[PDB]
Amino acid sequence: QIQGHYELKFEAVREAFAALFDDPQERGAGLCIQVGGETVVDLWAGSADKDGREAWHSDTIANLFSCTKTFTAVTALQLVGEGKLSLDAPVVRYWPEFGQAGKASVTLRQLLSHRAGLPAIRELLPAEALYDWQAMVDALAAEAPWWTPGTEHGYAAITYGWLIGELIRRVDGRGPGESIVARTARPLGLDFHVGLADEEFHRVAHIAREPEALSTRAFTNPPAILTSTNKPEWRRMQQPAANGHGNARSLAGFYAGLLDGSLLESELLDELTREHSLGQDRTLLTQTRFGLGCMLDQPDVANATFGLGARAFGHPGAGGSVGFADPEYDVAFGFVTNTLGPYVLMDPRAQKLVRVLGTCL
């Protein structure tokens, strides 16, 4: 049963959302769209658990994977605004140990745009290493760049979490998850978590099924990351690249907060959405386009378009969840699924939903 509300003008979006569940593997999903800060679509449907015994509620939340990266980037840019970070200062200034193995001149701008050259860790780590914050931060401090920093880009699927998170932790004097939720979620009352208390576990959807395939193991080192998404420890840890918990409504609320100037001053939003990386991704081996911790629309690239205007910015998660803002149409878009597809970038399910929204506008 499709639940929630829509303006009659967007009935086609409700129809397309219903069409998702014509596929029997679809378990649960949420879809939320704001136009000019007005919620025109707020839909959810199906089940949250693996076995269809617990229905998807309005307040059902889920792992949003790399949807998280833009929340983390916005947190970093606020710290820049407050003079606690500089985009073009060498990180050593905040994180002196980072300066090992050729990283004496690596900047926050390079880390946010995937140009720093730390897409993955070379030495294959045990699964537990993931849950040891100090171990992962010490590993990355000691890790050599995979290319001359600033000269190429390669998507940093999970390493991004410790790289930006450690800088957040050192300059904001609290855990990076606490910083992100305090700066991007609380001010707007978004149902969004980086580090999830057990009191909330009751309303968490069960996640089920190229990413594992990659020669650059951005997703699979430490191993069993995307096979551990439903683990309590994974929920409780702070992973600013990967473990943000929320739904379509939090995603839409965050992006509406970006469009209306709630979360970033216009100068800092101009930096976030400025093209920093365009071309063959050294991790994904496909044409990617990055701002600071967001992807920018490529209108003629099938797997790398949000499905609306050329100025759309945001970040999909592996498996098909996506949030973005389109300043041309004043759109804030959120889609959450617990049924992961095989795409790291745009999922065709999400692109069709956006394209039907496009028709209604």
TrEMBL record:
Highest taxon, organism lineage: Bacteria
Stored Pfam families: Beta-lactamase
Matching InterPro entries: Beta-lactam-related, Beta-lactam/transpept-like, Beta-lactamase/esterase
TM helices/strands, residue ranges: none
Residue ranges occupied by any Beta-lactamase-related domain in the UniProt entry: 17-351
SUPFAM superfamilies (alphabetical): beta-lactamase/transpeptidase-like
Name by which UniProt lists this protein: Carboxylesterase
Species of the source: Pseudomonas putida (Arthrobacter siderocapsulatus)
Gene transcribed to yield this protein: estC
